[PDB]
């Protein structure tokens, strides 16, 4: 009977090992000793995708933490999967990830993984389909459940804002800013320790609206998705890419913390190659140097052998080209 | 086939015996002879809950009208139940209630029983989940079906507005006022005889925004849900409670009619007792004294043996502590 | 797969499968073809695709009968939201593809009509068969516009059949709100295919265009809809002058400035099959509305070429004409010559 459906519960914080909260201070993330912190890690696939082939298991997190140098895993929660498993079940699996990550001393970014224009509720593909109501309810449920959990560090409100050339609606920063502020307010009402992560347009590439109209809330960070072909100089060299990246997103790191929550590449004739992820490989060192110099955090897309661009070519973790490259970067940074 | 689905029908007003319309005049409800009317009664449970145990029957209304002194029953229509039964079936059951109530000379308050913040479509619990679209459609359908029906006196638009400490959204009176005004316009386009009942924030406790920004429509009343622990005076007496009640909701009764559409208590150590309904029993006399001196209408929550605070222990109507108290209040008021 | 991550991205209609057929465009108050010649849409509604499928009447032979024997150059498809949901987008679009091929084979054009009745801003409607949301409406037009990019056969996107608040029982009718919402739909459509013709309707069931004099839709290439059923205008004395004047006041004036399509019109006898206000008439309306539209150069699609939905143009699927059917058949055959 519907009147017997129970009220929800909160994650048991006493079940966790000691782990520092991460906080925002100025343009930096800091730990609870005030030391500058950067998120460095990978995306994995949606929980439901992983479960379907029995790959949702602690051993995945152990591989990443022990052999790939990560301190962070981004979970791209697809709305269609949230519905298919159902909130109750999906949250039970996120609980597993919290325990696994906490045991390894690594952090999670929870990403509401839609692509499109939330104010008109139009999207790139049905797997990303959602509504304002459902998006708010997702964040309400997450915020309540993971109150006071240091492991869950960042709430990435809406993966990739885009109107696809205004075919989805009229992109309007004021409208999107207001909606983000509304989501932030629901979260902060419930847990002030979490870091909301806000994205710009052009699939989370273009932060330039914040130069004059930044989100008017404290404690937030900005996302950036600097895939190789987002910037399109004729002469492909460091100086030209840096000029273009500076203008569209890199400038943000001067004032706010930035997480490049997707980045990566595959050869133009490789597996799952498509605009804007095609590159000859020179992008790898370029984006890493750029982020290193600016102190930008990152999670590579994607530690999965099916979804592209892949970091691994099979579930024995055989590295792809970009996987081998980023593996060494992250291991060296962990050292 | 969908193109053969019929258009809706209106309730047959000739099926009813004579019963006065209730109307709003200034700060009072009145009947069709101008006599001041006070709604005094109870909530019963959602229709679907009652049907599930075969307790949706005229006998329930007879018990209340004959033995408990009520002149009003409030029906808390839960959105999840509206969906589960479906509109067509649920309306057929409301039609039964209308006939039963009319035959007994009592009135109905129809309550769209949600708890949360309709402008952001976020709620306390999924049983209350709704949308602006579904809420409008509920009122559209009700207004059409029950046109010119005196028995159905009050349309209580949204039971308990709350943002749960702004976890559901940012409470904003202007926005809420505007949405109620939109709903009222839909209703009044269809039936100007009905009384809309509008609620404030803090679970329909706080009407204070209306001091400066009242709903800009005539013929409405305001809800109040003055549970015992809503007001929290350090020193618990008539003076301090009356002052706090005055400030947040009682003042409204100076200017508009007010229905306390939920009130009641359970002893603090009682099975199932919770904030804000815990009380040592002194609230009963105090809230009744306050309401009586201000001429405030009321429907006790709840005449059900399961849903708390209960007025009865079982379906033989054994009164609970608050049940026994309010029964004697209502029987005495009916004789006055 | 039954796996959601394997669901393909959508595809566009194969424009190479089509015979040559001119695009129709808007220029001033006229429709024109690709030679610059003034074009007039003249044809009929048929029923919703799902209704027709249910009895195996969604057939090429229906389009052939109309094009070959009834003088039409246009068919309007009234896509009901409940049917969109019942068949599902993917399947419904596959059936629209059939219509595109049929119409192109015959050299005739389609008007695609998102066939709801009510007030989209509040998402409240006349009947559940018309029920929709802003989200679903936008998505319909997004999908349609993508699929039929660069397809001349598909000429007009009729955004929302019949705006009405039913005496403000559905919401407060408000031109500014409605204008803005139509502009929003147009922007999404134009971002995907600038060649299409959006068709915008006013209140009172797509009858009152008068608000456009000072508050027209602020986009180029727009046509306006009117549904001038016989009892919409109510002159005290029934004669040509009084009907023409009332028609010009509420909608016909629009044709002086913009192209207009009367996407529903027609009548039945007051004691006839399915008779109801506002479609009852003794027949004098037929010559009147045709004379008026021909003077103004107004395009039209009669409601409806179906034996079940009323007012009918035919009594059976052998195409035996009803009173209005025979009348309009003669008019359209003469106009085609
Ligand atoms: O079935 C089609 C195709 O799917 C490919 O995997 C997809 C990923 O490439 C895709 O990654 C994108 C992110 O979701 C976006 O946020 C970002 O804009 O772009 C990323 C790179 O495209 O994710 C989806 C799931 O969201 C995957 O389905 C397969 O690799 C490929 O084999 C297959 O043909
Ligand atoms: O299943 C949990 C619990 O349900 C209890 O019954 C509930 C009622 O107590 C509850 O009453 C509330 C009103 O609906 C609200 O408007 C008001 O704010 O607060 C009232 C409580 O003080 O109603 C719900 C249905 O809406 C009932 O489920 C049972 O009493 C209890 O035994 C059971 O464990
Ligand atoms: O089942 C009831 C009744 O349905 C009739 O068919 C309906 C059509 O008459 C109706 O046409 C209307 C248009 O849809 C509207 O846009 C316009 O305002 O009014 C038209 C009528 O004047 O369409 C619906 C589908 O939308 C049909 O169901 C049958 O003709 C009748 O026999 C039957 O009893
Ligand atoms: Cl519970
Ligand atoms: Cl576990
Ligand atoms: Cl964009
Ligand atoms: Cl803040
Ligand atoms: Cl009876
Ligand atoms: Cl509140
Ligand atoms: Cl406020
Ligand atoms: Cl008024
Ligand atoms: Cl109207
Ligand atoms: Cl207006
Ligand atoms: Cl334009
Ligand atoms: Cl009629
Ligand atoms: Mg946390
Ligand atoms: Mg484009
Ligand atoms: Mg009434
Ligand atoms: Mg008894
Ligand atoms: Mg076209
Ligand atoms: Na579009």
From TrEMBL, chain B:
GO terms for molecular function: hydrolase activity, hydrolyzing O-glycosyl compounds; metal ion binding. Residues 31-304 form the Glycoside hydrolase family domain. InterPro entries: GH, Glyco_hydro_5. Keywords: Glycosidase, Hydrolase, Metal-binding, Signal. Mg(2+) binds at residues 149, 152. Transmembrane segments: none annotated. One of its GO terms (biological process) is glucan catabolic process. Belongs to the glycosyl hydrolase 5 (cellulase A) family. This is Putative retaining b-glycosidase. The gene is cel5F.
